Each structure stands twice: as C-alpha cells, then as structure tokens.
Amino acid sequence: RKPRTIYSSFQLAALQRRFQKTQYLALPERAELAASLGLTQTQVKIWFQNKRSKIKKIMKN
DNA sequence: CGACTAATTAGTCG
DNA sequence: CGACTAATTAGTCG
C-alpha cells in the first residue's frame, strides 16, 4: 500500500475551508485545488471521500 | 469508463 | 488504547 500522506496544517486548512462551500468537486475544480496545494488529484479525491464519510457517520451516530 | 458509497485496513498521536 | 483519518476494496451508477 501507498504510504499514508501527512497533510500540513496549511493543506488541511485549505481542504477544510473548501469543503465548507463545496462537498463535491467538479473535475476542473479538483485539478485546480490539488495543484494549488502541491497534491495529486487522487490525494484530493480521497480526502473528499473520507471527509464525506466522516459527516455521514456523524449523521448516523 | 470513472464518479460515488460503505466497509474495511492500518498509521498517527493525544 | 482509541478517535481520527489516509488508503484499499468491492460494489453501484443509467
């Protein structure tokens, strides 16, 4: 397996700020966001999956 | 095709 | 240890 990414406080703040406004990203958005943070689109896509899952599990807790 | 999901697996750190 | 969460799996979706 791929080693676990360690997000810097800057990348996490940015992802969290974006998620407040955009829960699902369009492809061009995902590309722009990932490039802005020095990440791959896969790392961004997986962060959004996991963040959506965090919210859903709270909803069903 | 490649988005999504729930479930799972496994690393981080208070 | 345990909440958290990054990465993987095995499906669905029109």
PDB file of C-alpha atoms (C1' of nucleotides) in Angstrom:
ATOM      1  CA  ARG A   1       0.000   0.000   0.000  1.00  0.00           C
ATOM      2  CA  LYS A   2       0.827   3.701  -0.616  1.00  0.00           C
ATOM      3  CA  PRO A   3       2.378   5.289   2.492  1.00  0.00           C
ATOM      4  CA  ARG A   4      -0.029   7.455   4.409  1.00  0.00           C
ATOM      5  CA  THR A   5       0.089  11.152   3.352  1.00  0.00           C
ATOM      6  CA  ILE A   6       0.787  13.612   6.149  1.00  0.00           C
ATOM      7  CA  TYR A   7      -1.038  16.814   5.368  1.00  0.00           C
ATOM      8  CA  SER A   8       0.466  20.046   6.638  1.00  0.00           C
ATOM      9  CA  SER A   9      -1.746  22.345   8.684  1.00  0.00           C
ATOM     10  CA  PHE A  10      -1.878  24.609   5.527  1.00  0.00           C
ATOM     11  CA  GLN A  11      -3.217  21.871   3.233  1.00  0.00           C
ATOM     12  CA  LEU A  12      -5.736  20.708   5.873  1.00  0.00           C
ATOM     13  CA  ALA A  13      -6.992  24.300   6.490  1.00  0.00           C
ATOM     14  CA  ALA A  14      -7.420  24.736   2.748  1.00  0.00           C
ATOM     15  CA  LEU A  15      -9.242  21.446   2.216  1.00  0.00           C
ATOM     16  CA  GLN A  16     -11.491  22.128   5.208  1.00  0.00           C
ATOM     17  CA  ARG A  17     -12.238  25.712   4.037  1.00  0.00           C
ATOM     18  CA  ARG A  18     -13.086  24.457   0.550  1.00  0.00           C
ATOM     19  CA  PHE A  19     -15.289  21.667   1.918  1.00  0.00           C
ATOM     20  CA  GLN A  20     -17.414  24.239   3.820  1.00  0.00           C
ATOM     21  CA  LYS A  21     -18.534  25.540   0.406  1.00  0.00           C
ATOM     22  CA  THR A  22     -18.013  22.580  -1.976  1.00  0.00           C
ATOM     23  CA  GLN A  23     -18.756  18.992  -0.761  1.00  0.00           C
ATOM     24  CA  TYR A  24     -18.472  17.513  -4.318  1.00  0.00           C
ATOM     25  CA  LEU A  25     -15.833  18.853  -6.707  1.00  0.00           C
ATOM     26  CA  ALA A  26     -16.152  19.213 -10.492  1.00  0.00           C
ATOM     27  CA  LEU A  27     -13.087  17.795 -12.316  1.00  0.00           C
ATOM     28  CA  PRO A  28     -11.585  21.244 -13.140  1.00  0.00           C
ATOM     29  CA  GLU A  29     -12.027  22.262  -9.508  1.00  0.00           C
ATOM     30  CA  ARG A  30     -10.351  19.207  -8.219  1.00  0.00           C
ATOM     31  CA  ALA A  31      -7.427  19.795 -10.622  1.00  0.00           C
ATOM     32  CA  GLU A  32      -7.063  23.475  -9.613  1.00  0.00           C
ATOM     33  CA  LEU A  33      -7.292  22.711  -5.879  1.00  0.00           C
ATOM     34  CA  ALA A  34      -4.831  19.837  -5.943  1.00  0.00           C
ATOM     35  CA  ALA A  35      -2.244  21.894  -7.952  1.00  0.00           C
ATOM     36  CA  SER A  36      -2.695  24.843  -5.522  1.00  0.00           C
ATOM     37  CA  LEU A  37      -1.782  22.627  -2.572  1.00  0.00           C
ATOM     38  CA  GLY A  38       1.011  20.554  -4.098  1.00  0.00           C
ATOM     39  CA  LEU A  39      -1.164  17.465  -4.099  1.00  0.00           C
ATOM     40  CA  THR A  40      -2.333  14.925  -6.566  1.00  0.00           C
ATOM     41  CA  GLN A  41      -5.968  14.798  -7.630  1.00  0.00           C
ATOM     42  CA  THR A  42      -6.025  11.329  -6.105  1.00  0.00           C
ATOM     43  CA  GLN A  43      -4.935  12.602  -2.715  1.00  0.00           C
ATOM     44  CA  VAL A  44      -7.649  15.352  -3.012  1.00  0.00           C
ATOM     45  CA  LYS A  45     -10.326  12.877  -4.217  1.00  0.00           C
ATOM     46  CA  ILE A  46      -9.615  10.530  -1.299  1.00  0.00           C
ATOM     47  CA  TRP A  47      -9.677  13.400   1.221  1.00  0.00           C
ATOM     48  CA  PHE A  48     -13.120  14.420  -0.058  1.00  0.00           C
ATOM     49  CA  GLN A  49     -14.328  10.764   0.120  1.00  0.00           C
ATOM     50  CA  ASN A  50     -13.105  10.424   3.663  1.00  0.00           C
ATOM     51  CA  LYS A  51     -14.469  13.823   4.753  1.00  0.00           C
ATOM     52  CA  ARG A  52     -17.915  12.976   3.296  1.00  0.00           C
ATOM     53  CA  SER A  53     -17.776   9.689   5.141  1.00  0.00           C
ATOM     54  CA  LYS A  54     -16.906  11.469   8.424  1.00  0.00           C
ATOM     55  CA  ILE A  55     -20.053  13.615   8.076  1.00  0.00           C
ATOM     56  CA  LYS A  56     -22.266  10.661   7.147  1.00  0.00           C
ATOM     57  CA  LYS A  57     -21.133   8.659  10.164  1.00  0.00           C
ATOM     58  CA  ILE A  58     -21.935  11.606  12.473  1.00  0.00           C
ATOM     59  CA  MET A  59     -25.372  11.806  10.818  1.00  0.00           C
ATOM     60  CA  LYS A  60     -25.993   8.085  11.640  1.00  0.00           C
ATOM     61  CA  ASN A  61     -24.374   8.048  15.071  1.00  0.00           C
TER      62      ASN A  61
ATOM     63  C1'  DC B   1     -15.081   4.295 -18.282  1.00  0.00           C
ATOM     64  C1'  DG B   2     -14.539   6.920 -13.542  1.00  0.00           C
ATOM     65  C1'  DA B   3     -17.507   9.227 -10.297  1.00  0.00           C
ATOM     66  C1'  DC B   4     -19.593   7.694  -5.952  1.00  0.00           C
ATOM     67  C1'  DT B   5     -20.617   4.702  -1.498  1.00  0.00           C
ATOM     68  C1'  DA B   6     -19.949   1.689   2.982  1.00  0.00           C
ATOM     69  C1'  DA B   7     -16.924  -1.129   4.870  1.00  0.00           C
ATOM     70  C1'  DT B   8     -12.515  -2.174   5.909  1.00  0.00           C
ATOM     71  C1'  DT B   9      -7.465  -1.873   6.902  1.00  0.00           C
ATOM     72  C1'  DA B  10      -3.899   0.309   9.090  1.00  0.00           C
ATOM     73  C1'  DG B  11      -0.856   4.553  10.505  1.00  0.00           C
ATOM     74  C1'  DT B  12      -0.704   8.810  13.968  1.00  0.00           C
ATOM     75  C1'  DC B  13      -0.713  10.764  18.231  1.00  0.00           C
ATOM     76  C1'  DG B  14      -3.117  12.650  22.427  1.00  0.00           C
TER      77       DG B  14
ATOM     78  C1'  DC C   1      -5.502   2.072  23.904  1.00  0.00           C
ATOM     79  C1'  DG C   2      -8.828   4.663  20.983  1.00  0.00           C
ATOM     80  C1'  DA C   3     -10.582   8.596  17.961  1.00  0.00           C
ATOM     81  C1'  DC C   4      -9.184  10.028  13.864  1.00  0.00           C
ATOM     82  C1'  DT C   5      -8.323   9.500   9.149  1.00  0.00           C
ATOM     83  C1'  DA C   6      -5.419   8.098   4.752  1.00  0.00           C
ATOM     84  C1'  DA C   7      -5.637   4.260   1.693  1.00  0.00           C
ATOM     85  C1'  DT C   8      -7.906  -0.004  -0.089  1.00  0.00           C
ATOM     86  C1'  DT C   9     -11.896  -2.954  -1.551  1.00  0.00           C
ATOM     87  C1'  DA C  10     -15.898  -4.252  -3.804  1.00  0.00           C
ATOM     88  C1'  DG C  11     -19.847  -2.884  -5.048  1.00  0.00           C
ATOM     89  C1'  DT C  12     -23.431   0.738  -7.723  1.00  0.00           C
ATOM     90  C1'  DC C  13     -24.427   4.164 -11.238  1.00  0.00           C
ATOM     91  C1'  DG C  14     -28.285   4.731 -16.311  1.00  0.00           C
TER      92       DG C  14
END
